[PDB]
Amino acid sequence: MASGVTVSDVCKTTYEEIKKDKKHRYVIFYIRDEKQIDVETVADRNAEYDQFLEDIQKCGPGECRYGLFDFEYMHQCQGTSESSKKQKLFLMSWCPDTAKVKKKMLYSSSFDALKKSLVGVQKYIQATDLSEASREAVEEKLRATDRQ
């Protein structure tokens, strides 16, 4: 990583689909050649967050990953179960920053780089280790930027 990342076309095609048809519920980005952004994992609502969690950590422990998720979250308030169905896009960087510095240098540039490609996402948050990246930890950061 020499500060300045190239986004692969796989990211564009996924975004153009997820923005219109959104049958690519969440796209997992991987870091390409340690200087480019790539898409090496895609999944839809057929898989749940548990399967998502297990599969990514199975694919690799300590490297850089990203995830753009467009889902309709129903937020209810005041004990009134109106359930405000709000579709929200979130970007999450799955990368152990606490690991090898050569690895965290890579996502350092690309974290802001892909924001240009998947522009329109609401919140971008990083999750380092499996302790920080869990299904519950995912719902916490998505509601933290919401409104009661």
From Swiss-Prot:
Other observations noted: The name 'twinstar' derives from the characteristic aberrant arrangement of asters seen in mutants.
Functional summary from the UniProt entry: Exhibits F-actin depolymerizing activity and regulates actin cytoskeleton dynamics. Required for cytokinesis in both mitotic and meiotic cells and for aster migration and separation. Promotes cell motility during ovary development and oogenesis. During larval development, required for the cell rearrangement needed for formation of terminal filaments which are stacks of somatic cells that are important for the initiation of ovarioles. Also required for border cell migration during oogenesis. During border cell migration, required for actin turnover and lamellipodial protrusion.
Membership in a protein family: Belongs to the actin-binding proteins ADF family.
Gene name, Swiss-Prot/TrEMBL: tsr
UniProt GO MF annotations: actin binding; actin filament binding
Gene3D superfamilies: Severin
Effect of disrupting the coding gene: Late larval or pupal lethality with mutants showing defects in cytokinesis in both mitotic and meiotic cells, abnormal accumulation of F-actin in mature primary spermatocytes, and defective aster migration where the asters remain in close proximity to each other rather than separating from each other and migrating around the periphery of the nuclear envelope as in the wild type. Failure of terminal filament formation in the ovary at the third larval instar at 25 degrees Celsius but formation occurs at 18 degrees Celsius.
Domain ADF-H: 4-143
PANTHER family: COFILIN-RELATED (PTHR11913)
KW Phosphoprotein (keyword) present: yes
Lineage: Eukaryota, Metazoa, Ecdysozoa, Arthropoda, Hexapoda
SMART domains: ADF
Record's subcellular location: Cytoplasm, Cytoskeleton; Nucleus matrix
Name used for this protein in its record: Cofilin/actin-depolymerizing factor homolog
